[PDB]
């Protein structure tokens, strides 16, 4: 029996609404927009429903406040969060969003425990780890969207320097989705050409590369300070959809995301940004980049950053 | 010389941002997001830029507050308006938005007078007429988005009754974008089958048809009541993109929109919702539907309702 | 468990290869190209495989001569046929292609009896009926591609007259895929406007309409006489894919195709061209067009044509 | 003035027809299918025209034998060649195809001298050089399709070893389109990970890499041996479309193709397979890969192999 693909979006704010919009536009799946706030998901679902005929999609998009409606969901995308943008650090939402995810975990565990779960809620890496422990879902079926967003920014900034199509830039950001984030310059290439060659050719300087690395790391504030009323939401939505595509279409796509890293990068069992292979069984493998001694040290510092915020959460009131 | 297609979006609020997102996603054109509000268009443009590599698009999307940047725009889409949603009627925003469109008119006249202009700002039909007068652009290069949204809603509700793909429903809403809009039930077909045949076959009643007609006319309120923060914006954005597509691709597509009707539907020279043919020369034609006497009268009421609001604008302080 | 969608293409000639190409391009499913001819499916599958990375699709396309490889197929598309184009009538291939379908029926019945089967092999309507009887598959899970091709031609010719987008022309061809084919002029509309109105407006004559009807009926020879080495294959392939999409995505799409018509159009249980609704359960409903007395008579003549060729087959050597 | 994009396809055989099909499907441009063979281009154009409404495209596709019809073409793609496949080497077709391209050269020079020309006719690199000389078009507006096909094969085979999405493999083939082609294994990465790292990790051996390199170079024979009626045509068609896209959309895309290399890879002014940047001005740049000494030598052999065949053409009867 052919059953329609089904994606549950938990939290129908800025990011949640865009996800439903894009999923519906692509006819990737039916969408269930869940929110505790009255009217909002229903209003967005009705609005998006009207656009479906315009896009030529037969996707159904509905709004709900009832976890029963997410039963049979193939993918669950968690965007739920307490109000207000972070001032200086994504960790400011730690305590509130952890409690939200406790509730979301009970909903998923009861109504769709076989779903592939993509966490978006900040602070991403710690939230992903929290959700996995509380929900009890397999490690390979729970991950966090971050790397795709960070790497896309990294790739975009490199592409903007050289004036080329960003799709032809290969570039990875790894580690935690925070200031300790590691854009791995060593394995950057533009159509096969490494950055070291472009330096010799006089087309880019090491200082320009450092500026691009810094830009990647602080990119979230650049967007947030301009929007004023919140953080980025167009690209993070698109990124979550790319991850859902990889699972639903069994792409074996290489996806940088927050995944349970057990026998790679010198860590013994932690959720952090790593290049994964995603397919019909969720996170199916992790790829090991060729890191320089400096990059290994920077990754080490990112890991400490993650563990620090995680311990703070473990000692929450 | 091959040149990139360019779409200027005047007003980077709810609808404007979504237009930029979708246009970018489809790689239909480069986008210039214009707004007077500080930060907003810049923030959205940067966020949407980060998503382009995720979508595999090379569209550039920039934010600005300078009309010089809309220079050489192939299409201009106007979403600019005063804040706050309408409580009962779209006409409450009349005088404020008229002042705004004067600024846009002088901007377009100076920097891109050959552009195809699609107005979205409410009250739609009067705003379109106003923009054409002040800007001095050809009647065929200036129209308003409404019919696509209204017809899409009409098609969606018919499709939901019969349980079929809305894309296989043909249906038009004509007249002004307001309570007086005419969902032409005589124009309706589902896979070639007219509503009269469905009544005879006992697959729909006249009461159900009346309900669908009513639903269409007040659909905006159903969305707005649930959103709380404002009016519909996912579907209106998509509708504008469909109209921009018809122009940029020279589709010769049937597009219900607010266009200068000079010798059809028993009017002499007025902007109202009619089925047009849109291609590379803007509004290239208007189709004459086979309206019943009741529908002709309903359309007459709509025309007067439009003329009423238009005269009030002519008698300004 | 997410399993990839799988389409089996039985016969890897002109049409079969294009189907695999388009399915792969769209990433609609994995494709199995089956043929008894050595090398051909394998060569086409390898060639098409190389194009997948270019299209950004992860679809797997393989060639085979083994029916075991079509097990678990969601859709089976039958293109298998004896060599050579028909001279004057599609019925010339009757006896040979019936025997091929006996063999194909055994393959499907054994390895994928729950598949949605779309027959393409000519003479279409009789071949569809033959396959259903020999295979023993449910009537709603076996249909023939024809109406989509015939209607697309009908729509295209109307659209070419008016100089508009063919997607905005609603037009149906019903009955058997042969000379008795019935393009139903009565229910043609262009953006809501019926042909009767265009006649009054002086934009089309009844003689031009008759020419378009004739063109639709003899369209196959116009293509075949130009190609010389065979019959049409680009559009029939595309048409089969549209039908596969409707099933796999549960579109509830209105699809004119050869379906088992039991309580409609005055027939008591025959495969002929009718507007169907297709979804995850195959042919889920049949729509009844509003036919004129003349059109009812023409349909009657088409039905006789179908029954005549069917009786000939029943008395085969 | 908005004008439709126009692509002329010179030669409506296996590849030419597929190009028209895909270009139409994507609504990338209008297509003119040119051929001297009677009926063929007309038959394919009509067949493909019928599919346009199925794809929701408004692209026009016409067939012709008159060069006046390629007037105003933005892109010209040359597939014209003498019949019969190569047995061992692509160079067997040298003199025949050279005569053909003289006709095409004079046609393009007369009717669309500002066109971007993509040659496909074998022997590719020599034919490209020949067409440029005879036609007198700028070096940057004339290139050949080969690298995209060779690189796509290379990427596909690497991806199949690692079991990942080929789109996430970066890999280049450079030099002439023949046995001397250089799959640059030093350029290869899979999600940022180079082959050297995969060897160290025990996920691939050097022998397996050597096999992949060999597979790439003789991939054309594997397809041709299985097709029997001719050489590959699904993937070569798709490759040409990707190149046309880069030009028409001004992508600034990294495209390995046969381009006029004047001051890179240690050559003075020759057409050979190199990574280019393609945008609205044709070949806008050439990237310099970080080749090993072995790869530099292999490339040197390829350059001579190309020069050999080129000199034979210069010494015609
Ligand atoms: N991982 C990343 O790269 C990344 C990028 C950007 C934003 N984010 C994060 O994503 C989250 C969402 O961002 P946003 O802009 O959509 O926020 P938002 O405030 O617009 O939306 C949050 C929504 O969650 C809902 N909600 C609150 N409590 C809930 C509960 N218990 N159950 C269900 N829903 C609940 C709210 O009603 C609201 O609609 C934030 O935590 C943000 O920091 C992450
Ligand atoms: N035609 C339809 O069917 C339809 C449907 C929905 C909404 N609308 C209308 O579309 C308009 C926009 O809706 P929205 O939700 O995007 O509103 P919004 O408030 O989110 O956006 C309006 C934007 O216009 C900007 N603006 C204000 N003054 C300006 C000026 N002088 N120049 C340039 N920009 C200026 C604001 O900064 C704001 O960003 C409204 O008038 C609404 O009623 C029409
Ligand atoms: N329904 C329609 O609208 C429509 C339109 C066009 C063509 N057609 C029909 O579709 C059929 C295929 O057309 P085509 O151009 O692809 O023909 P083709 O000759 O190019 O391909 C037929 C293929 O079937 C294979 N074949 C033969 N016997 C077989 C068997 N027992 N099992 C499996 N495969 C076998 C052959 O090897 C060949 O590759 C023809 O009957 C044609 O008349 C139908
Ligand atoms: N670059 C690559 O990687 C690559 C890959 C595959 C094939 N090819 C080459 O592409 C070419 C075409 O392949 P195909 O399979 O389409 O061949 P084909 O024989 O199917 O098509 C060639 C067409 O050219 C036409 N033609 C002959 N003389 C002509 C003239 N003077 N003007 C215009 N048209 C003329 C023929 O009528 C025929 O339709 C071949 O040379 C082949 O070797 C190149």
User: Could you give the CA distance from residue C288 to residue B197 in angstroms, rounded to a whole number?
Assistant: 8
User: Could you give the CA distance from residue B159 to residue A53 in angstroms, rounded to a whole number?
Assistant: 10
**According to the entry, how was the structure determined?**
X-ray
Coil, strand or helix: which one is D173? strand
Shared domain check, C173 and C24: no
Residue D266 burial (10 A CB sphere; 0-12, 13-18, 19+): exposed
B292 touches chain C (CB under 8 A): no
A196 touches chain D (CB under 8 A): yes
Pocket residues: Cβ below 6 A from ligand 2:
B 10-16, 35-37, 40, 79-81, 83, 93, 100, 103, 120-122, 124, 145-146, 149, 177, 230-233, 236
> Is the CB of residue A271 less than 8 Å from the CB of residue A144?
yes
User: Could you give the CA distance from residue C20 to residue C79 in angstroms, rounded to a whole number?
Assistant: 12
Start-to-end CA span in chain A (Å)? 49
Q: Which residues of C touch B57 (CB under 8 A)?
A: none
Give every CB contact of residue D118 below 8 A, 6+ residues apart in sequence. Answer: D75, D76, D77, D78, D143, D144, D145, D240, D243, D244, D257
Q: Which residues of D touch C165 (CB under 8 A)?
A: 58
Last residue of a domain, one of D146, D164, D195: D146
Calculate the CA A144 to chain-centre distance.
Answer: 5
Shared domain check, B288 and B183: yes
The three state secondary structure string of chain A is CCCCCEEEEECCCHHHHHHHHHHHHHCCCEEEEECCCCCHHHHHHHHHHHHHHHHCCCCCEEEECCHHHHCCCCEEEECCCCCCCCCCCHHHHHHHHHHHHHHHHHHHHHHCCCCEEEECCCCHHHHHHHHHHHHCCCHHHEEECCHHHHHHHHHHHHHHHHCCCHHHEECCEEECCCCCCEECHHHCEECCEEHHHHHHCCCCCHHHHHHHHHHHHHHHHHHHHHHCCCCCCHHHHHHHHHHHHHHHCCCCEEEEEEEEECCECCECCEEEEEEEEEECCEEEEECCCCCCHHHHHHHHHHHHHHHHHHHHHHCCC
Q: Are strands B169-170 and D173-174 parallel, antiparallel or unpaired?
A: unpaired
Angle (CA) D280-D286-D288 rounded to 5° is 155
User: Could you give the CA distance from residue A10 to residue A77 in angstroms, rounded to a whole number?
Assistant: 6
The three state secondary structure string of A71-108 is CCCCEEEECCCCCCCCCCCHHHHHHHHHHHHHHHHHHH
Pairwise CB contact (< 8 Å): B166 & A51: no
- Sheet with C193-194: list strands edge to edge: C169-170, C189-190, C193-194
CA distance D243 to chain C (A): 10
User: Could you give the CA distance from residue B28 to residue B74 in angstroms, rounded to a whole number?
Assistant: 11
B5 touches chain A (CB under 8 A): no
Counted residue by residue, chain D has a size of 317
Shared domain check, C282 and C188: yes
Pairwise CB contact (< 8 Å): C187 & B194: yes
Nearest to C271 by CA among C305, C243, C236: C305
CA distance C80 to chain B (A): 30
Task: Locate D46 and state its tokens.
Answer: 């009509």
Mutation to test the C interface, candidates D234, D253, D257, most C Cβ within 10 Å: D234
Nearest to D259 by CA among D121, D125, D76: D125
Identify which of A190, A251, A287 has the shortest CB distance to residue D191.
Answer: A287
User: Could you give the CA distance from residue A8 to residue B14 in angstroms, rounded to a whole number?
Assistant: 23
Query: D97-132 burial, b for 16+ CB within 10 Å, e for fewer?
Result: bbebbeebbebbeebbeebbbbbbbbbbbbbbbbbb
CA distance C189 to chain D (A): 15
Task: Locate B184 and state its tokens.
Answer: 């032409």
Identify which of A192, A254, A277 has the shortest CB distance to residue D289.
Answer: A192
Shared domain check, A166 and A52: no
Q: Are strands A270-279 and A253-261 parallel, antiparallel or unpaired?
A: antiparallel
Ligand nearest the Cα of residue A92 is: 1
User: Could you give the CA distance from residue B185 to residue B151 in angstroms, rounded to a whole number?
Assistant: 11
CATH of the domain at D310: 3.90.110.10
- For the Cβ of D233 lying below 6 angstroms from any atom of ligand 4, the answer is yes
Is D52 annotated in a binding site? The answer is no
> Is the CB of residue A194 less than 8 Å from the CB of residue A158?
no
Q: Which residues of A touch C280 (CB under 8 A)?
A: 1-4
B4 touches chain D (CB under 8 A): yes
User: Could you give the CA distance from residue D269 to residue B86 in angstroms, rounded to a whole number?
Assistant: 67
Counted residue by residue, chain A has a size of 317
CA distances A260 to A91, A132, C80, Å, are 20, 10, 49
Angle (CA) C247-C253-C259 rounded to 5° is 70
Residue D223 CB neighbours (<10 A) = 26
Angle (CA) C99-C100-C104 rounded to 5° is 120
Dihedral through CA A60, CA A61, CA A64, CA A68, nearest 10? Answer: 40
> Is the CB of residue A93 less than 8 Å from the CB of residue A64?
no
β-partners of residue A62 are A32
The Å distance, Cα A79 to ligand 1 centre, comes to 4
Closest residue CA from atom 2 of ligand 2 = B146
Shared domain check, A304 and A177: yes
Nearest to A271 by CA among A303, A312, A308: A303
Q: Are strands D253-261 and D270-279 parallel, antiparallel or unpaired?
A: antiparallel
β-partners of residue C75 are C7, C116
Q: Which residues of B touch A63 (CB under 8 A)?
A: 226
Task: Locate C269 and state its tokens.
Answer: 């249980």
Mutation to test the B interface, candidates C287, C291, C295, C299, most B Cβ within 10 Å: C287
Q: Which residues of A touch B49 (CB under 8 A)?
A: 156
* Number of domains forming the structure of chain D: 2
Nearest to A141 by CA among A129, A132, A133: A132
Shared domain check, C115 and C154: no
The secondary structure element, H or E, covering residue C271 is strand C270-279
Angle (CA) B6-B10-B11 rounded to 5° is 135
Shared domain check, D28 and D1: yes
The Å distance, Cα A244 to ligand 1 centre, comes to 18
| Residue D177 a catalytic site member | yes
Coil, strand or helix: which one is C256? strand
Determine phi and psi for D88, rounding to 5 degrees: -120, -45
Q: Which residue of chain A has the CA closest to C248?
A: A2
B56 touches chain A (CB under 8 A): yes
Task: Locate B110 and state its tokens.
Answer: 């100076």
Calculate the CA B220 to chain-centre distance.
Answer: 13
CA distances B75 to A212, B6, C165, D199, Å, are 33, 7, 20, 53
A140 touches chain C (CB under 8 A): no
- Sheet with B193-194: list strands edge to edge: B169-170, B189-190, B193-194
Shared domain check, B117 and B75: yes
User: Could you give the CA distance from residue A59 to residue A52 in angstroms, rounded to a whole number?
Assistant: 7
Last residue of a domain, one of A89, A117, A146: A146
Dihedral through CA B105, CA B107, CA B109, CA B110, nearest 10? Answer: 160
The Å distance, Cα A15 to ligand 1 centre, comes to 7
> Is the CB of residue A44 less than 8 Å from the CB of residue A63?
yes
Shared domain check, B72 and B120: yes
- For the Cβ of D107 lying below 6 angstroms from any atom of ligand 4, the answer is no
Calculate the CA B144 to chain-centre distance.
Answer: 5
Task: Locate A209 and state its tokens.
Answer: 């590369």
Pairwise CB contact (< 8 Å): A280 & C252: no
> Is the CB of residue A127 less than 8 Å from the CB of residue A118?
no
B249 touches chain C (CB under 8 A): no
In B27-76, which residue ranges form alpha helices assigned H by DSSP?
40-55
Determine phi and psi for D278, rounding to 5 degrees: -110, 130
Last residue of a domain, one of D126, D146, D166: D146
Residue A227 CB neighbours (<10 A) = 21
Coil, strand or helix: which one is C118? strand
The Å distance, Cα B177 to ligand 2 centre, comes to 16
Calculate the CA A163 to chain-centre distance.
Answer: 27
Start-to-end CA span in chain C (Å)? 49
Identify which of B58, B74, B251 has the shortest CB distance to residue D251.
Answer: B58
User: Could you give the CA distance from residue B244 to residue B282 in angstroms, rounded to a whole number?
Assistant: 10
Nearest to D57 by CA among A217, B190, C242: C242
Q: Are strands A142-144 and B173-174 parallel, antiparallel or unpaired?
A: unpaired
DSSP state of B91: G
Give every CB contact of residue A105 below 8 A, 6+ residues apart in sequence. Answer: A131, A134, A135
Give every CB contact of residue A91 below 8 A, 6+ residues apart in sequence. Answer: A123, A126, A178, A309, A312
Calculate the CA C294 to chain-centre distance.
Answer: 26
Q: How many CA atoms lie within 13 A of C64 on its CB side?
A: 15
The secondary structure element, H or E, covering residue B193 is strand B193-194
Coil, strand or helix: which one is C75? strand
Task: Locate C233 and state its tokens.
Answer: 């294959």
User: Could you give the CA distance from residue C268 to residue C270 in angstroms, rounded to a whole number?
Assistant: 7
Residue B300 CB neighbours (<10 A) = 16
Task: Locate A97 and state its tokens.
Answer: 């969003």
Is D122 annotated in a binding site? The answer is yes
CATH of the domain at A7: 3.40.50.720
Counted residue by residue, chain B has a size of 317
User: Could you give the CA distance from residue C129 to residue C285 in angstroms, rounded to a whole number?
Assistant: 18
The Å distance, Cα D94 to ligand 4 centre, comes to 13
Shared domain check, A154 and A285: yes
Residue B239 burial (10 A CB sphere; 0-12, 13-18, 19+): buried
Pairwise CB contact (< 8 Å): D253 & A164: yes
The Å distance, Cα D37 to ligand 4 centre, comes to 12
Domain limits at B256?
Answer: 147-317
CA distance B123 to chain A (A): 19
CA distance B154 to chain A (A): 9
- For the Cβ of A28 lying below 6 angstroms from any atom of ligand 1, the answer is no
Selected residues 258-277 of chain A with any CB under 8 Å from a CB in chain D: 275, 277
Shared domain check, B229 and B100: no
Shared domain check, C35 and C133: yes
């Amino acid at each position: 029996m052919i059953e329609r693909r089904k994606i549950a979006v938990i939290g129908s704010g800025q990011i949640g609404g865009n996800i439903a919009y894009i999923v519906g536009k692509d006819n990737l799946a039916d969408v269930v927009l869940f929110d505790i706030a009255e009217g909002i998901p229903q209003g967005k679902a009705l609005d998006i429903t009207h656009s479906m005929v315009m896009f030529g999609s037969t996707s159904k998009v509905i709004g709900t406040n009832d976890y029963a409606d997410i039963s049979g969901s193939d993918v669950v995308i968690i965007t739920a969060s307490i109000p207000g943008r972070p001032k200086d650090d994504r960790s400011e939402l730690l305590f509130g969003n952890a409690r939200i995810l406790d509730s979301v975990a009970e909903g998923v565990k009861k109504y769709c425990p076989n779903a592939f779960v993509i966490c978006i809620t900040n602070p991403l890496d710690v939230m992903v780890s929290h959700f996995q422990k509380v929900s009890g879902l397999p490690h390979n079926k729970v991950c966090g969207m971050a790397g795709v967003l960070d790497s896309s920014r990294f790739r975009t900034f490199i592409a903007q320097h050289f004036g080329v199509n960003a799709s032809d830039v290969s570039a990875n950001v790894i580690g935690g989705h925070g200031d300790g984030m590691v854009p791995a310059t060593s394995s950057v290439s533009v159509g096969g050409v490494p950055l070291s060659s472009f330096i010799k050719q006089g087309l880019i300087t090491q200082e320009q590369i450092d500026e691009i690395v810094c830009h990647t790391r602080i990119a979230w504030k650049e967007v947030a300070d301009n929007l004023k009323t919140g953080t980025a939401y167009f690209a993070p939505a698109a990124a979550a959809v790319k991850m859902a595509e990889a699972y639903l279409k069994d792409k074996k796509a290489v996806v940088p995301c927050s995944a349970f890293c057990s026998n790679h990068y010198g860590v013994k069992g932690i959720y952090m940004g790593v290049p994964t292979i995603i397919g019909k069984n969720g996170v199916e493998d992790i790829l090991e980049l060729d890191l320089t001694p400096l990059e290994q040290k920077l990754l080490g510092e990112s890991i400490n950053e993650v563990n620090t915020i995680s311990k703070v959460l473990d000692n929450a009131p």
